[PDB]
Amino acid sequence: DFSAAVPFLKRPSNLDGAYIGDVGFDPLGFSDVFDLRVLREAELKHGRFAMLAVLGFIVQELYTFPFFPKMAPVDAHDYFVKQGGGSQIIFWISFVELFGVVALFETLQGKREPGDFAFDPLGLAKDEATLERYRLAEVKHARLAMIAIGGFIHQYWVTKQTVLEQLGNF
Amino acid sequence: VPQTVAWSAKTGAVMVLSNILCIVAGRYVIQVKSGSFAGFGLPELLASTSLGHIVGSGAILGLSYVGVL
Amino acid sequence: MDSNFLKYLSTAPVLFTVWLSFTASFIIEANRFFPDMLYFPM
Amino acid sequence: VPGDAGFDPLTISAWLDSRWLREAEIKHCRVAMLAAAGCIAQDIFQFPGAKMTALHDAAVKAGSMGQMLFWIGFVEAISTAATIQMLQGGRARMELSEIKNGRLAMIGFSGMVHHYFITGKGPIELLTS
């Protein structure tokens, strides 16, 4: 059959709706070679980091903590490389990513969904149907935010104005 | 430096001659394929004309070298 | 982790290289922090 | 099969895939359609901030042509997936009209660019002057 997204491209054949958010889009054929659990692991991880980054880029413009000096987020990266806070964040992410390595091994061995860490403290996933719609929304937001974060950082480079101030000006 | 010349109809003449020469001569010599209307196809035409631009380029450059042009 | 990959890491050349690289590394570190130990200091 | 006037004098169709030939021809058709209609449109009216051939290098320095190349390059990567999957395996009039107007557009565009070489002018400008 044909891909739902691209009508004239054939369906990849490793993508038969097994993973939510599948629209049959995979022209370069990475699912014909590589494991889709690993690729969905990577898609959801990149997407969650990007979603947090876009929220951070905007909120950091709106507010910053009193103990830290006020500055733009790219300058924040460089300041906290030299200050020590960046190493703390890198270390704690690396610490969590150790048990993430264990989690990815559990996914490869079949006993875990690729983005599932059982992280539902506030019980928002009331029912299975609600979870399916929520994870479709998570996939769509994750992809959209990857595009968005690239835009903010690259535009900041080209025009040295922050995202809220760039919308505010021009 | 050997003297070459800007393109004129004599250069065109040498190219055309070598090209036709290579068509006819190749048509006989080639061992796998109405003197030119039997078994003449695109790879034979493209090969004879490639040897035609090789013989013709050599002929143009040599005749420019010696002064015949 | 896969048991066949862990069985490969248990092969003699891998363990030999890892063990003596670890051994070499703590001799190097001990001579970095405590260099030129010609004698037991006493 | 559309636009078949029995015109293959050198018989290229015998020594290259007919699907590859048709996809290449229809791509050439549509590109020259856009190029010729654009060629006349540039002289008719102009977008803000802004000849036939010199404009290529007047546009590359801004970064416009680099941008258009990047987006055509993206689409052409998906289109190379399309043509490989094509190759690895009341409307017929509309396709035939497309193919005829596209061949006409290739001739027209070739004409306009060499006329630019002749006179340093665009198509309808040459007609006006």
Place this chain on the structure above:
Amino acid sequence: KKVSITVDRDPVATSFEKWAQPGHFSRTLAKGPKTTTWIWNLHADVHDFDSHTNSLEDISRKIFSAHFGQLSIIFLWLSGMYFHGARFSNYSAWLSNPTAVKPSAQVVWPIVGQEVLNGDVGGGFQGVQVTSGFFQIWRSSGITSEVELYWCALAGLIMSGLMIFAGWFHYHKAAPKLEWFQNAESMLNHHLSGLLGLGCLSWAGHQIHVSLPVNKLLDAGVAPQEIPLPHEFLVNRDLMAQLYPSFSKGLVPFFTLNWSEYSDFLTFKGGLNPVTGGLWLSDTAHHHLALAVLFIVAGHMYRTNWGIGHSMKEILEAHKGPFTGEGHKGLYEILTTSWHAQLAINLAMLGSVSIIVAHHMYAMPPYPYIATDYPTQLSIFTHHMWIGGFCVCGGAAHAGIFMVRDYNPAQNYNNLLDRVIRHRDAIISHLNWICIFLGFHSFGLYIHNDTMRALGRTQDMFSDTAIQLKPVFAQWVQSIHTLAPGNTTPNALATASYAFGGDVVAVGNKVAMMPISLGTADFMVHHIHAFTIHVTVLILLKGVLFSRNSRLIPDKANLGFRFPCDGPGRGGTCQSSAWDSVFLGLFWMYNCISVVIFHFSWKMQSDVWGTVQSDGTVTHITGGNFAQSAITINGWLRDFLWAQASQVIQSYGSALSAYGLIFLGAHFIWAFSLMFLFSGRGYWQELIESIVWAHNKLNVAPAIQPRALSITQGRAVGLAHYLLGGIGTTWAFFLARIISVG
């Protein structure tokens, strides 16, 4: 369309299971070790694919994927050379001041006092001086900054990942069938036209659009950061026209065949650039463009899918005369069914090309400022002579493996192979006689001179002063090459190389190149070369020709390529295999290449390299002592080895103390090798018995019963440590000597 792509999909499963089962590839080794010999037997035969598998298809698939793995290693290595140039080097300082800063791209960590190796190479830098000539390559490329070296290192890393992916993909996912590999015409068409011709053409485009403008600006004297970036040469044709005005005409002179317009940048100057001491890059650009056309034309010779072209089998089968029976019939079948026969040819060619590369690069120095970097010139000559000698001996190793294994007499009746094997006694007896004659009349001249010089009879010597052996043919050929510009190469402006005669080229007050005169000493050492090459051929040719049978052992092919002996009978048949002639011929290769690199080192120091001074006179490194002292063995011992080992043995406490240590370490390893070469296995097995007894006494005997190494492995260990120690000692001596004095 009989040339077609054919692929098996998903042949081999990507599993870690066989990784955990060492020896899985052969029936003997897969049942596990019982003695320590199994361990050695595991590593020895592992890449011998045609000993594990019967089918030519699976063998071909393993070879194709192993070639991608080798390419991945080479790309990672290149990426590391570029990264170390970008990050740990003084390349930028070298670009500003080449004739003063010494290249260095390796920095050591401070651990046990070893930071003494970070010597003062110049340009505000401390590190190990590097002699691979990468800096001169990068300057010829027009790199001019460390940032572009970071992009090259990344390009190497991306290619390395793509090659290791392709090897996995083409063994485990998409493996070609045997009929794909058995397309010699298609492969040659693509490797001549596509690999070589397009490669030359693309490099010619880089030289014309990037190397030539950047290097013209550098040799004018413009600072590296003042030089425009390479793409502004590509877009703005006006600046390129300012450097070379022919670019104002574009590609109209190319297509209309008015090629003499392009003489600004496509020259035939010859000689060297006076500023850099290197080849004119306009000459190298015209050279690569000319090669590209020839290689692409060469690529249209063979027939693939449209009737035009040659059948390679028909070419071979037609060449037969009255002396040679059936002629070259049956050679096509051999060379498309035997991988070893192809490897024998390609190894002999790669080794020959590497020796030619060695000769041509010192005599016609191609890179800017490489001619006056004397450590690099000595290093790249010595390195490519050793690669050449090794690859040449591997050609005879795999000719022997072909004869023992892949040769079948039924398909080789009365052709050229059959006829060579049927007069191999006449071949080996005439070669043996040549080697005796040429050892007497080359080395005996040295022994005659030592005796006469010792006896006080200096008029009875073979020397320039006394009886003269003049190399008249080589001197005459040098005359022809000096007369050639304007005469037999009329459009040439200078000679191909100043070694033949002509001017002295000086760069940074150091000689780039100057005529290399030939005298009695040059005649003698050239016949030394002819002698050592002849006997090495005799040992390898005798091994290939007698690999299957002899008068001694009539059934040598049933014992194989590599067997130790056939017993103490028939007087003793120790070292009778073809493998043992490769074993003995690598010693004679070592002897040959050692005298070649010693001849090069002493002759260049004595008569070419040095400092130009007032009045145009040149002071050479060892002051012209080659002529009167390379005529005796005592002269080579005293005035070459003893005199020039001063720098290596006095190097302790300096940055060259590493060479001082490697000199001794290699002297040690060399001596240690003779323990394996002069001894026999039976002694070591009986000694191991008593050591096993002492382990048995303490109940600590191993379950893998220790054995002395096999007879063949004892020979291989001795040869490997002999080669390592001898070459390593020469490496340390050559490098400490030429870094100190050159």
